[PDB]
Amino acid sequence: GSSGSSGTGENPFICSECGKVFTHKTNLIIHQKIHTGERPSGPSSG
Numbered sequence: 001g002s003s004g005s006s007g008t009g010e011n012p013f014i015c016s017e018c019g020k021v022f023t024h025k026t027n028l029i030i031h032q033k034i035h036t037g038e039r040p041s042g043p044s045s046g
């Protein structure tokens with residue numbers, strides 16, 4: 001009977017997308033860019 005969880009060590013920032021920690025908030029924002037850059041399926045509408 002053990003939860004087996006963890007979480008001891010405050011963090012500056014984390015990419016909710018993938019989960020990458022960055023020293024500066026600027027470095028993180030610049031990274032997230034990779035997450036925001038995909039094209040939609042297409043014209044498929046009807």
Ligand SMILES: [Zn+2]
Nearest residue numbers: 015017018019
């Ligand atoms: Zn990311």
